[PDB]
Design an enzyme around this catalytic site. Structure first.
Site, PDB file in Angstrom:
ATOM      1  N   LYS B  53       0.819  -1.198   0.000  1.00 49.06           N
ATOM      2  CA  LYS B  53       0.000   0.000   0.000  1.00 49.06           C
ATOM      3  C   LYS B  53       0.859   1.256   0.000  1.00 49.06           C
ATOM      4  O   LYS B  53       0.565   2.183  -0.767  1.00 49.06           O
ATOM      5  CB  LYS B  53      -0.985   0.090   1.169  1.00 49.06           C
ATOM      6  CG  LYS B  53      -2.094  -0.953   1.203  1.00 49.06           C
ATOM      7  CD  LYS B  53      -2.923  -0.675   2.477  1.00 49.06           C
ATOM      8  CE  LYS B  53      -3.953  -1.732   2.752  1.00 49.06           C
ATOM      9  NZ  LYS B  53      -4.743  -2.056   1.545  1.00 49.06           N
ATOM     10  N   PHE B  54       1.905   1.298   0.826  1.00 50.29           N
ATOM     11  CA  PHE B  54       2.763   2.468   0.842  1.00 50.29           C
ATOM     12  C   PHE B  54       3.457   2.666  -0.509  1.00 50.29           C
ATOM     13  O   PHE B  54       3.765   3.786  -0.904  1.00 50.29           O
ATOM     14  CB  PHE B  54       3.842   2.399   1.902  1.00 50.29           C
ATOM     15  CG  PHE B  54       4.538   3.685   2.226  1.00 50.29           C
ATOM     16  CD1 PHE B  54       3.817   4.820   2.613  1.00 50.29           C
ATOM     17  CD2 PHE B  54       5.906   3.763   2.141  1.00 50.29           C
ATOM     18  CE1 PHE B  54       4.476   5.992   2.954  1.00 50.29           C
ATOM     19  CE2 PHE B  54       6.568   4.934   2.467  1.00 50.29           C
ATOM     20  CZ  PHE B  54       5.849   6.061   2.870  1.00 50.29           C
ATOM     21  N   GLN B  55       3.938   1.560  -1.102  1.00 51.68           N
ATOM     22  CA  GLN B  55       4.640   1.642  -2.394  1.00 51.68           C
ATOM     23  C   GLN B  55       3.726   2.270  -3.434  1.00 51.68           C
ATOM     24  O   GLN B  55       4.205   3.078  -4.201  1.00 51.68           O
ATOM     25  CB  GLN B  55       5.136   0.277  -2.900  1.00 51.68           C
ATOM     26  CG  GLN B  55       5.939   0.288  -4.217  1.00 51.68           C
ATOM     27  CD  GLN B  55       7.327   0.837  -4.016  1.00 51.68           C
ATOM     28  OE1 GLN B  55       8.064   0.311  -3.184  1.00 51.68           O
ATOM     29  NE2 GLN B  55       7.748   1.908  -4.686  1.00 51.68           N
ATOM     30  N   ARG B  56       2.458   1.915  -3.472  1.00 52.45           N
ATOM     31  CA  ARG B  56       1.520   2.498  -4.413  1.00 52.45           C
ATOM     32  C   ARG B  56       1.279   3.976  -4.103  1.00 52.45           C
ATOM     33  O   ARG B  56       1.234   4.821  -5.004  1.00 52.45           O
ATOM     34  CB  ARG B  56       0.194   1.739  -4.346  1.00 52.45           C
ATOM     35  CG  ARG B  56      -0.838   2.232  -5.343  1.00 52.45           C
ATOM     36  CD  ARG B  56      -2.262   2.054  -4.824  1.00 52.45           C
ATOM     37  NE  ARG B  56      -3.154   2.920  -5.565  1.00 52.45           N
ATOM     38  CZ  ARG B  56      -4.325   2.679  -6.104  1.00 52.45           C
ATOM     39  NH1 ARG B  56      -4.900   1.495  -6.004  1.00 52.45           N
ATOM     40  NH2 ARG B  56      -4.935   3.649  -6.772  1.00 52.45           N
ATOM     41  N   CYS B  58       3.487   5.989  -2.644  1.00 51.29           N
ATOM     42  CA  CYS B  58       4.663   6.693  -3.150  1.00 51.29           C
ATOM     43  C   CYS B  58       4.671   6.710  -4.689  1.00 51.29           C
ATOM     44  O   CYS B  58       4.924   7.775  -5.285  1.00 51.29           O
ATOM     45  CB  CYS B  58       5.978   6.115  -2.635  1.00 51.29           C
ATOM     46  SG  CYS B  58       6.116   6.344  -0.804  1.00 51.29           S
ATOM     47  N   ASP B  59       4.310   5.600  -5.341  1.00 53.14           N
ATOM     48  CA  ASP B  59       4.404   5.620  -6.814  1.00 53.14           C
ATOM     49  C   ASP B  59       3.420   6.608  -7.423  1.00 53.14           C
ATOM     50  O   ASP B  59       3.759   7.200  -8.445  1.00 53.14           O
ATOM     51  CB  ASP B  59       4.206   4.241  -7.435  1.00 53.14           C
ATOM     52  CG  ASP B  59       5.407   3.339  -7.205  1.00 53.14           C
ATOM     53  OD1 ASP B  59       6.528   3.780  -6.907  1.00 53.14           O
ATOM     54  OD2 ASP B  59       5.165   2.132  -7.289  1.00 53.14           O
ATOM     55  N   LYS B  60       2.266   6.817  -6.804  1.00 54.71           N
ATOM     56  CA  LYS B  60       1.274   7.750  -7.265  1.00 54.71           C
ATOM     57  C   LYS B  60       1.396   9.177  -6.732  1.00 54.71           C
ATOM     58  O   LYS B  60       0.654  10.036  -7.209  1.00 54.71           O
ATOM     59  CB  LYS B  60      -0.114   7.238  -6.836  1.00 54.71           C
ATOM     60  CG  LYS B  60      -0.490   6.061  -7.728  1.00 54.71           C
ATOM     61  CD  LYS B  60      -1.894   5.600  -7.376  1.00 54.71           C
ATOM     62  CE  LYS B  60      -2.910   6.719  -7.604  1.00 54.71           C
ATOM     63  NZ  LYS B  60      -3.954   6.703  -6.535  1.00 54.71           N
ATOM     64  N   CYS B 162      -1.165  23.704   6.249  1.00 56.15           N
ATOM     65  CA  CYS B 162      -0.776  23.863   4.869  1.00 56.15           C
ATOM     66  C   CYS B 162      -1.294  25.069   4.124  1.00 56.15           C
ATOM     67  O   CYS B 162      -0.678  25.409   3.100  1.00 56.15           O
ATOM     68  CB  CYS B 162      -1.232  22.681   4.004  1.00 56.15           C
ATOM     69  SG  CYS B 162      -0.421  21.149   4.473  1.00 56.15           S
ATOM     70  N   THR B 195       6.455  15.295  12.682  1.00 61.75           N
ATOM     71  CA  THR B 195       5.421  14.460  12.161  1.00 61.75           C
ATOM     72  C   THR B 195       5.812  13.069  11.703  1.00 61.75           C
ATOM     73  O   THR B 195       4.941  12.222  11.564  1.00 61.75           O
ATOM     74  CB  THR B 195       4.703  15.189  10.983  1.00 61.75           C
ATOM     75  OG1 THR B 195       3.459  14.462  10.830  1.00 61.75           O
ATOM     76  CG2 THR B 195       5.500  15.180   9.720  1.00 61.75           C
ATOM     77  N   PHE B 213       4.874  14.529   2.883  1.00 58.99           N
ATOM     78  CA  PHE B 213       5.469  15.697   3.509  1.00 58.99           C
ATOM     79  C   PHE B 213       6.983  15.705   3.427  1.00 58.99           C
ATOM     80  O   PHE B 213       7.671  14.708   3.696  1.00 58.99           O
ATOM     81  CB  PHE B 213       5.001  15.819   4.985  1.00 58.99           C
ATOM     82  CG  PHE B 213       3.530  16.097   5.203  1.00 58.99           C
ATOM     83  CD1 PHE B 213       2.943  17.230   4.682  1.00 58.99           C
ATOM     84  CD2 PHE B 213       2.775  15.299   6.034  1.00 58.99           C
ATOM     85  CE1 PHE B 213       1.609  17.542   4.943  1.00 58.99           C
ATOM     86  CE2 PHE B 213       1.428  15.563   6.276  1.00 58.99           C
ATOM     87  CZ  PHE B 213       0.836  16.680   5.727  1.00 58.99           C
ATOM     88  N   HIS B 301      -1.507  25.086  -3.627  1.00 58.10           N
ATOM     89  CA  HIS B 301      -0.780  24.242  -2.678  1.00 58.10           C
ATOM     90  C   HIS B 301      -0.983  22.800  -3.127  1.00 58.10           C
ATOM     91  O   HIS B 301      -2.119  22.319  -3.178  1.00 58.10           O
ATOM     92  CB  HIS B 301      -1.346  24.469  -1.243  1.00 58.10           C
ATOM     93  CG  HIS B 301      -0.698  23.466  -0.328  1.00 58.10           C
ATOM     94  ND1 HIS B 301       0.618  23.564  -0.015  1.00 58.10           N
ATOM     95  CD2 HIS B 301      -1.164  22.347   0.249  1.00 58.10           C
ATOM     96  CE1 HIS B 301       0.966  22.540   0.781  1.00 58.10           C
ATOM     97  NE2 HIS B 301      -0.103  21.800   0.946  1.00 58.10           N
ATOM     98  N   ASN B 334       5.365  17.865  -0.403  1.00 54.12           N
ATOM     99  CA  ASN B 334       4.475  18.831   0.243  1.00 54.12           C
ATOM    100  C   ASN B 334       5.179  19.404   1.475  1.00 54.12           C
ATOM    101  O   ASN B 334       5.301  18.718   2.501  1.00 54.12           O
ATOM    102  CB  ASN B 334       3.155  18.181   0.608  1.00 54.12           C
ATOM    103  CG  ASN B 334       2.218  19.009   1.488  1.00 54.12           C
ATOM    104  OD1 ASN B 334       2.541  20.112   1.922  1.00 54.12           O
ATOM    105  ND2 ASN B 334       1.029  18.474   1.711  1.00 54.12           N
TER     106      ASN B 334
HETATM  107  O1  LIG Z   1       1.269  16.640  10.278  1.00 56.42           O
HETATM  108  C1  LIG Z   1       1.560  17.675   9.658  1.00 56.42           C
HETATM  109  C2  LIG Z   1       2.975  17.984   9.259  1.00 56.42           C
HETATM  110  C3  LIG Z   1       3.175  19.404   8.739  1.00 56.42           C
HETATM  111  C4  LIG Z   1       4.555  19.453   8.001  1.00 56.42           C
HETATM  112  C5  LIG Z   1       4.792  19.265   6.636  1.00 56.42           C
HETATM  113  C6  LIG Z   1       6.070  19.504   6.063  1.00 56.42           C
HETATM  114  C7  LIG Z   1       7.142  19.711   6.956  1.00 56.42           C
HETATM  115  O2  LIG Z   1       8.357  20.006   6.484  1.00 56.42           O
HETATM  116  C8  LIG Z   1       6.789  20.149   8.238  1.00 56.42           C
HETATM  117  C9  LIG Z   1       5.654  19.636   8.858  1.00 56.42           C
HETATM  118  O3  LIG Z   1       2.165  19.662   7.803  1.00 56.42           O
HETATM  119  C10 LIG Z   1       0.865  19.532   8.194  1.00 56.42           C
HETATM  120  C11 LIG Z   1      -0.180  20.257   7.606  1.00 56.42           C
HETATM  121  C12 LIG Z   1      -1.521  20.017   7.939  1.00 56.42           C
HETATM  122  O4  LIG Z   1      -2.621  20.351   7.208  1.00 56.42           O
HETATM  123  C13 LIG Z   1      -1.773  18.846   8.679  1.00 56.42           C
HETATM  124  C14 LIG Z   1      -0.818  18.298   9.525  1.00 56.42           C
HETATM  125  O5  LIG Z   1      -1.148  17.355  10.474  1.00 56.42           O
HETATM  126  C15 LIG Z   1       0.517  18.622   9.204  1.00 56.42           C
END
Ligand SMILES: O=C1C[C@@H](c2ccc(O)cc2)Oc2cc(O)cc(O)c21
Ligand SMILES: O=C1C[C@@H](c2ccc(O)cc2)Oc2cc(O)cc(O)c21
Lengths: 387, 387
Positions: B53-56, B58-60, B162, B195, B213, B301, B334
C-alpha cells in the site's frame, strides 16, 4: 488598474477599539490560602522550606484571586500534571484545545453584544493563546462556535507569550486600516492547564509561575471608520512598535514538551523592563511632543508586581497611574496575553462610571505595553475617546 | 491631529513581492526507494500488505524526491520517533526548535541578498511554521540569527498548517500597505521531524502523510512603494480571502501530543477542494471581469497530486497551468506552508529564464491558493510584473 483597486480597497481613519468583553473560568481560587492548597494537591507538604518560600511569593504577588479551569477534582484525576515533570502534554492538550475556544467564545459573545452589529460583518479574526496548539486551530473552532462567516480571514497566533496582548493590537491595526469596512474580532484566551505543575526546590523560577499565572479571555472588536452613533469608539490606535531588549537573552523562556509548557526565568525581568522602558516611551512619544509620562494614561502587562513597582520607580509615575493595571493583577493575576485587554476594559469602565471626560482616565494620550519572551517589549500608542 | 498622523503613517501602493529565496535540508531522499527505506528504518518489514500500500502511495504521489532533516542515523538514535505512537515530543521539539530557524535563516539570507537593501530596513517579520513551538519563538530566534534590528515588529504564526503560505501573504499585505516604508521579511519554514512516525495498518491517513510531507523554507521581502530601479517587483498582491468549506468538518486535523504531531484525514480533500474552488475564483475574479481560468497564472498548494488533478478536471484547466506547481511537488514534495512560496519562485524564474513577457508566465493576473485544516481555502490574487 491596480492603483484604482488599491485606493478603493483601503480604509481611511485610525483603527479603533469598538467593544471589549471578558470571561474567566468559574472556579475562583483565593490567593491567601493557595500555598496550603497547592502544596497539598501536589503532594508536597513535606517540602517545608519550599512551602514557606511559596507563601512569601503568594503574599508578595499582590494577587487576591485567580480564576482557574483546573480544579481539585481535575488535578486528582491527573497526577502527572501535579508532578513537577511528568509526561502530561496529551492530557493538558485535551483540556486546553476545548477550553481556549470555549472561554474565548464567552468573551467574544460579550464584545459582539456590546458592539451591537451583525456577526456577519466580522471580516477578520485574530485568535491568540499561549495555551496549547492544534490543527485546525482555535481560530477555526471559534469561527464554528460563534457562527462567523466561513470566509472570515483568520490569523492564528499560537505559543505567543505575555507580550501578545500588544501583538494582537499591532496586527489588528494593520488589518482594520488597510481594508475598507473590515471589522476584526480579536480574542486572547489563556488557560494555565498547560503550565500548572508541582514544586521543585531547584526550580524556583518555575514556582513563581505557579503563584502568578491565572486564566481568562478578552475579546475586542477593532475597525477603522466607525459608523457615527451606530458604533461607539472606546480607544483609537495611533502607532505601534515591538523590540527586543539588549542583554536579555534567555530572560523568559517557555518550552512545549512532553511534560507540558515549562516556564523559566534566567534574568532580572523587572530590571530589564525598567532599564528599557524609557527608550520605548521616547520612540513612541517624542514625535508627539510628549515627555511627561504622568500626563498619559497607562496600561502595562502586570507580569508580576515587581515589574510595575520598578517601572513606577524608574519613571517617577504617580502611584495612581498603575491603578487599573494593579486592580486587574489583584482580581485575576497574570493572564498572559489577555491581561492588557482586561486592563483596557477596567480603565474605560471606571472612567465612564466615575464621570470622567475621556475613557483614558480623563487624559487624551496613553500607552499600552506588553512584556514577554525575547525579552520583548510591545508598545501601542492610544488616544482615548470623549466620554 | 490623529488624522494627520494617520495620513502620514500609511503606504500608498499595492504590497509587492520584491525577493524570494528558498532552502532545504541537505539530505535528499529519493521517492522511488523510499518505501523500502521507510519500512526498514521503522522495523515494519513484516507488514507486507501495508508496505505494498505504501509503495503504491509513493508511486502515485508524483514526488521524485524530498529533502529531510531526519536521517538514518538520527532515526536510529530515536526509536520512539520511528514508532507509530510513542512519547517523542521532547526529542522532536529539540530538533525543530533549532532546525526551523536555521533553515529559515538560509532562505532569508538568500532573499535579503536578492533584495539588495540593508537588513536594518526590515521593519516587520512574519515567521510561519507547522513544526514545533517555543517561547521566545522562531521569530525571536531568526531576529537574532539574521541580526535584524531589535525593534523589528514580529508576527509568530505557529501550528498553522498547509494553507498558511496564503495566510502569511494575506498578513504581509496589510502590514506593508498600512505602513509607509515598511519592508516585511516573510519566512515559512517547515521540518517534518515533528510528524514522521512509523506505519500502522488501521491508520492509512497517517501513512499518506509519510509519502507526501517534505522539508523546506522560503523567504520573501514584501513592501509597498518599491524604489524604482533600486528594488525590483516580482508580483503584486491585490486582494485576499480566507474561507471554510461547507461540509468539511474534520477533513484535515493535526494534534500536537506527547507522541508528536499526528496527521488525520477524515474526508475527501481533493473532492472538497474541487467542489469549492469555483466559488473562491468567482469571489476573487468576477469583480475584475475575469471568468477564463486559463487566462490567469496559477499557484496551488500541492497537498497531494489528486487535489491538483481534480481541480484541473473540474475547471478544465490546460495541463500546463499546473506545471510550476507540479514541478515543485516533484522536486520537494508537500512542504506545508512553504510550498506555494517555492512555486512562486519557480514560476518567476522559469518565466524570466524562457524570455516570457511577465513573471506570471507571460500573463497579467494570477491566483495563489493554500489549502489545509478547517477545511480552509486561502485565496491571494496576484498581478505579475513585466519582464
Ligand atoms: O502533520 C503535519 C505535518 C506538517 C509538516 C509538513 C512539512 C514539513 O516540512 C513540516 C511539517 O504539515 C501539516 C499540515 C496540515 O494540514 C496537517 C498536519 O497534520 C501537518
Ligand atoms: O508558562 C507559561 C504559561 C502561559 C499562561 C499564562 C496564563 C494562562 O491562563 C495561560 C498560560 O504564560 C506564559 C507566558 C510566557 O512569557 C512564559 C511562559 O512560559 C508562559
Amino acid at each position: 488598474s491596480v492603483s484604482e483597486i488599491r485606493k478603493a480597497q483601503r480604509a481611511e481613519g485610525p483603527a479603533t477599539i469598538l467593544a471589549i468583553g471578558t470571561a474567566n473560568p468559574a472556579n475562583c481560587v483565593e490567593q491567601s490560602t493557595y500555598p496550603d492548597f497547592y502544596f497539598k494537591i501536589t503532594n508536597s507538604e513535606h517540602k517545608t522550606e519550599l512551602k514557606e518560600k511559596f507563601q512569601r511569593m503568594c503574599d508578595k504577588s499582590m494577587i487576591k484571586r485567580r480564576y482557574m479551569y483546573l480544579t481539585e477534582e481535575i488535578l486528582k484525576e491527573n497526577p502527572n500534571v501535579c508532578e513537577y515533570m511528568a509526561p502530561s502534554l496529551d492530557a493538558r492538550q485535551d483540556m486546553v484545545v476545548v477550553e481556549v475556544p470555549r472561554l474565548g467564545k464567552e468573551a467574544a459573545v460579550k464584545a459582539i453584544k456590546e458592539w451591537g452589529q451583525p456577526k456577519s460583518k466580522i471580516t477578520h479574526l485574530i485568535v491568540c493563546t499561549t495555551s496549547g496548539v492544534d490543527m485546525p486551530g482555535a481560530d477555526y473552532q471559534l469561527t464554528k462556535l460563534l457562527g462567523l462567516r466561513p470566509y472570515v480571514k483568520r490569523y492564528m497566533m499560537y505559543q505567543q507569550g505575555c507580550f501578545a496582548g500588544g501583538t494582537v493590537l499591532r496586527l489588528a491595526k494593520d488589518l482594520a486600516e488597510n481594508n475598507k469596512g473590515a471589522r476584526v474580532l480579536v480574542v486572547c484566551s489563556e488557560v494555565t492547564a498547560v503550565t500548572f505543575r508541582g514544586p521543585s526546590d531547584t526550580h524556583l523560577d518555575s514556582l513563581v509561575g505557579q503563584a502568578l499565572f491565572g486564566d481568562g479571555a478578552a475579546a475586542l472588536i477593532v475597525g477603522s471608520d466607525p459608523v457615527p452613533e451606530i458604533e461607539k469608539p472606546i480607544f483609537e490606535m495611533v502607532w505601534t512598535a515591538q523590540t527586543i531588549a539588549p542583554d536579555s537573552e534567555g530572560a523568559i523562556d517557555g518550552h512545549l514538551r512532553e511534560a507540558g509548557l515549562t516556564f523559566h526565568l534566567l534574568k532580572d525581568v523587572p530590571g530589564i523592563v525598567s532599564k528599557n522602558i524609557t527608550k520605548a516611551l521616547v520612540e513612541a512619544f517624542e514625535p508627539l511632543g510628549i515627555s511627561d509620562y504622568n500626563s498619559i494614561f497607562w496600561i502595562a502587562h502586570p507580569g508580576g508586581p515587581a515589574i510595575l513597582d520598578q517601572v513606577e520607580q524608574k519613571l517617577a509615575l504617580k502611584p495612581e497611574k498603575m491603578n487599573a493595571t494593579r486592580e486587574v493583577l489583584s482580581e485575576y493575576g497574570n493572564m498572559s496575553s489577555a491581561c492588557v485587554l482586561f486592563i483596557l476594559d477596567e480603565m474605560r469602565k471606571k472612567s465612564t462610571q466615575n464621570g470622567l471626560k475621556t475613557t483614558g482616565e480623563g487624559l487624551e494620550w496613553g500607552v499600552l505595553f506588553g512584556f514577554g519572551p525575547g525579552l520583548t517589549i510591545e508598545t501601542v500608542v492610544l488616544r482615548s475617546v470623549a466620554i
